[PDB]
């Protein structure tokens, strides 16, 4: 049990342990706020996030539990990791605030390309996605602002609080699998290669039109898989557009990058390349190492189907804080 100290940070109040110093607001929001800090114990610069109204309601309580559970499970170089989780509370009764700690990251993919850089960045995203997907976890909202990158060009996936990077199947809500994330990677890789948003739709309808112009309208095989009567009708009522040749769209780009893009941006999710399969694509020949692209321990998401009371979620959250085991010093 450490010693905490208070201080007001941009309307937001903070009560962190002594080891953390020089809290400097990196931002704030409805979610709460994130402060840059110096970890006196390790000497490393960290990011400390205070959740706002963690247990204001059952949904909030559950979201709080969900985030903590996810963060505690992630142990991979290309995925945000939990350096520490703490609360000023001395017991469950007083338990009302949650602070999460991780290594400070300098910028995001938005803030920030040569082909070698695209290769290295996409390689790392895919390496992180292989790990996440092996634990039956789907990001569902991959985008540049969710990808942290430091000065070494090292990347970490995070989230897991916009439609420009969303797979078409999950933007209308048929069935979807882990590859919705692969689609997002495709949109991201395209943007890094061209410097422009691949599908900057004004809304979901416009978004879909933009996508179909590139990948072509659904073929007969894909149509046979659309259970939604209305969606099936709409799609079939549209202009029958031919699939463009990506080489003709991404002119001048590495032919291998073009090939990968064509394998990632496929409408039929059943045929979309997976993260593991993508890692072995020739485009990453310079970085791919089958012996160093680990999968994750099994992840128990059964809690997602549970309907509990606010007090019960708060309590489950409290236990997760208490049981937290710090990572080996780096
Ligand atoms: C919903 S809003 O757009 C929003 C923006 C940022 C964050 C946000 N949460 C974190 C953050 C901090 C510690 C953790 F353990 C986990 C996440 C960061 C962070 C991580 C590394 N370096 C600097 C800042 N940014 C949360 C919500």
Curated annotation (Swiss-Prot):
Cofactor(s), names only, from the UniProt record: Mg(2+)
Major localization listed first in the record, in broad terms: cytoplasm
GO annotation, cellular component aspect: cytoplasm; cytosol; glutamatergic synapse; mitochondrion; nuclear speck; nucleoplasm; nucleus; spindle pole
Enzymatic class: transferase
Subcellular location field: Cytoplasm; Nucleus
Residues that hold ATP according to the record: 26-34, 49
Pfam families hit by this protein: Pkinase (PF00069)
Active-site positions on this chain: 159 (proton acceptor)
Tissue specificity note: Macrophages, monocytes, T- and B-lymphocytes. Isoform 2 is specifically expressed in kidney and liver.
Keywords (A to Z) from UniProt: Acetylation, Apoptosis, ATP-binding, Cytoplasm, Kinase, Nucleotide-binding, Nucleus, Phosphoprotein, Serine/threonine-protein kinase, Stress response, Transcription, Transcription regulation, Transferase, Ubl conjugation
PTM per Swiss-Prot/TrEMBL: Dual phosphorylation can also be mediated by TAB1-mediated autophosphorylation. TCR engagement in T-cells also leads to Tyr-299 phosphorylation by ZAP70. Dephosphorylated and inactivated by DUPS1, DUSP10 and DUSP16. PPM1D also mediates dephosphorylation and inactivation of MAPK14.
GO biological process, one term: cartilage condensation
Chain positions found as Phosphothreonine: 12
Domain Protein kinase positions: 20-284
UniProt xrefs under Gene3D superfamilies: Phosphorylase Kinase, domain 1, Transferase(Phosphotransferase) domain 1
PROSITE patterns in UniProt: MAPK (PS01351), PROTEIN_KINASE_ATP (PS00107), PROTEIN_KINASE_DOM (PS50011)
Domain notes: The TXY motif contains the threonine and tyrosine residues whose phosphorylation activates the MAP kinases.
Subunit structure comment from the entry: Component of a signaling complex containing at least AKAP13, PKN1, MAPK14, ZAK and MAP2K3. Within this complex, AKAP13 interacts directly with PKN1, which in turn recruits MAPK14, MAP2K3 and ZAK. Binds to a kinase interaction motif within the protein tyrosine phosphatase, PTPRR. This interaction retains MAPK14 in the cytoplasm and prevents nuclear accumulation. Interacts with SPAG9 and GADD45A. Interacts with CDC25B, CDC25C, DUSP1, DUSP10, DUSP16, NP60, SUPT20H and TAB1. Interacts with casein kinase II subunits CSNK2A1 and CSNK2B. Interacts with PPM1D.
Protein role: Serine/threonine kinase which acts as an essential component of the MAP kinase signal transduction pathway. MAPK14 is one of the four p38 MAPKs which play an important role in the cascades of cellular responses evoked by extracellular stimuli such as pro-inflammatory cytokines or physical stress leading to direct activation of transcription factors. Accordingly, p38 MAPKs phosphorylate a broad range of proteins and it has been estimated that they may have approximately 200 to 300 substrates each.
Protein name: Mitogen-activated protein kinase 14
The organism of origin for this protein: Mus musculus
């Amino acid at each position: 049990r450490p010693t905490f100290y208070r201080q007001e940070l941009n309307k937001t109040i903070w009560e962190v342990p002594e080891r953390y110093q020089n809290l400097s607001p990196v931002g704030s929001g409805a979610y709460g706020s994130v402060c840059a800090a110096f970890d006196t114990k390790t000497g490393l610069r960290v990011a400390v996030k205070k959740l706002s109204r963690p247990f204001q309601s059952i949904i909030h309580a559950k979201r709080t539990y969900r985030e903590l559970r996810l963060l505690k499970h992630m142990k991979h170089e290309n995925v945000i990791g939990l350096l520490d989780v703490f609360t000023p509370a001395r017991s469950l009764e007083e338990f009302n605030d949650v602070y999460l700690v991780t290594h400070l990251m300098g910028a995001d993919l938005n803030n920030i390309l040569t082909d070698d850089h695209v290769q290295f960045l996409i390689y790392q995203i895919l390496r992180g996605l292989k790990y996440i997907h092996s634990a039956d976890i789907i990001h569902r909202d991959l985008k540049p602002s969710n990808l942290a990158v430091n000065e070494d060009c090292e990347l970490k996936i995070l989230d897991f609080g916009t439609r420009w990077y969303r797979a078409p199947e999950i933007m209308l809500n048929m069935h979807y699998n882990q590859t919705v994330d692969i689609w997002s990677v495709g949109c991201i890789m395209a943007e890094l290669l061209t410097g422009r948003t691949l599908f900057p739709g004004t809304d979901h309808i416009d978004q879909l039109k933009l996508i179909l112009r590139l990948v072509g309208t659904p073929g007969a095989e894909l149509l046979k898989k659309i259970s939604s009567e209305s969606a099936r009708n709409y799609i079939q009522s549209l202009t029958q557009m031919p699939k463009m040749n990506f080489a003709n769209v991404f002119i001048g780009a590495n032919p291998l990058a073009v090939d990968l893009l064509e394998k990632m941006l496929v409408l039929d999710s059943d045929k979309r390349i997976t993260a593991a399969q993508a890692l072995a694509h020739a485009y990453f020949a310079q970085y791919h190492d089958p012996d160093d692209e680990p999968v994750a321990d099994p992840y128990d998401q059964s809690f997602e189907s549970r309907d509990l009371l606010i007090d019960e979620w708060k309590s489950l959250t409290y236990d997760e804080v208490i049981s937290f085991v710090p990572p080996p010093l780096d």
